[PDB]
């Protein structure tokens, strides 16, 4: 039980499972969710719908932690990367700013067989 009202909202969207962390303006996390937290179990964790509940839940949870506005950060190319942010604009927090920051290597590590074409 503290107070924040303003902070960061990362989204770690994936072709397997979107997940949302919410942190203070310094990076230290406050509350998080994901298709896992929310009931879903198998693939279903990926669905845009899942990404919705995950986002909302995570906001709801920080609504009580005392928060009103947040800066969004996107990372990954989720099946529901977008409905993760859309759930936020329709969540009840001032989405100050939405920034994309997906990590991309400047060509370095060999990927898995399934990701070939970049040794």
């Amino acid at each position: 039980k503290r107070q924040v009202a303003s902070g960061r909202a990362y989204i770690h969207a994936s072709y397997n499972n979107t997940i949302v962390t919410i942190t203070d303006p310094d990076g230290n996390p406050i509350t998080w969710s994901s298709g896992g937290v929310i009931g879903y179990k198998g693939s279903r964790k990926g669905t845009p719908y899942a990404a919705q509940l995950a986002a909302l839940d995570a906001a709801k949870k920080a609504m009580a932690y005392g928060m009103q506005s947040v800066d969004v950060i996107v990372r990954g190319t989720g099946a529901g990367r977008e409905q993760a942010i859309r759930a936020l604009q329709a969540s009840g927090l001032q989405v100050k700013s939405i920034v994309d920051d997906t990590p991309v290597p400047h060509n370095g590590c060999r990927p898995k067989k399934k990701f070939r074409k970049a040794s």
Partner: protein
Amino acid sequence: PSRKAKVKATLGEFDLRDYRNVEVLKRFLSETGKILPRRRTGLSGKEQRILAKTIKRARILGLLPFTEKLVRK
């Protein structure tokens, strides 16, 4: 099909080699630090090819970003 002005005509008598004129080079980078395609820096094979190395030099003196973040996504 992706159109606008070329960064070239927006500038004047300028040195394509000065790794220190951050004030100009920046123009040849996107929102991300990414270096602009020829079809936008409006340069020529050789010109472009020089602006490349001249940038990457500045990128090492930390006068230019290797990469940036995309606002509004």
